[PDB]
């Protein structure tokens, strides 16, 4: 049974995960931005980067933003969307939460959100989070509302990859 560090090392060699920005450290206890996680999803699921399209109005979300091709890909794929459909705000620099990551992976894996889900998650996410817990993507005592640690994201990505091979 691989450790989180072993899983990270496998995913890093595969080009799916990177070290913590500006370092060579895995920093498994640190958090991850929504921008960085969009890139993880693109690499994990083999999505095509989308250049020259901008679906959001966040300040400094434009052609100079390195993450736009990744964010656009996960948007086109239906994995991520805005937090605010009026102002069209993705919150690219906000940290990805456990329940947000759960939605992306449940969606990519074509798992059914759980009806009548009763758990700690924000209302919109209860079904997604429950499906992710039931599939072993996050541990049962993970806080859906917390920022996901890099460890948790490695564990979840690794399990998603295992579920995508066949
Ligand atoms: C606060 O609104 C929620 O925002 C969530 C942000 O995280 C993800 C995973 C996303 O699509 O990026 O899920 C979003 C939720 O669907 C929800 N957004 C909307 C428009 O209902």
Residue numbers in the entry: 28 to 193
Question: Could you share sentences copied from the article?
Answer:
Prokaryotic cell envelopes often include proteinaceous surface (S-) layers composed of self-assembling subunits in porous two-dimensional crystalline lattices.
To demonstrate conclusively the significance of the conserved SLH-Gly29 and the backbone flip for SCWP binding, we created a double mutant SpaASLH/G46A/G109A for binding and structural analysis. Residues 46–55 in G1 are in a similar conformation as in the unliganded SpaASLH/G109A structure, but with a slight widening of the loop to accommodate the Gly46Ala mutation. Despite the lack of binding detected by ITC, ligand is again observed bound in the G2 pocket, albeit with Gln108 and Ala109 in the unliganded backbone conformation (i.e., not flipped). The observation of bound ligand in the crystal structure despite no binding being detected by ITC, similar to the observation of 2:1 binding in the wt SpaASLH crystal structure despite 1:1 binding measured by ITC, indicates again that affinity is markedly increased in the crystal context.
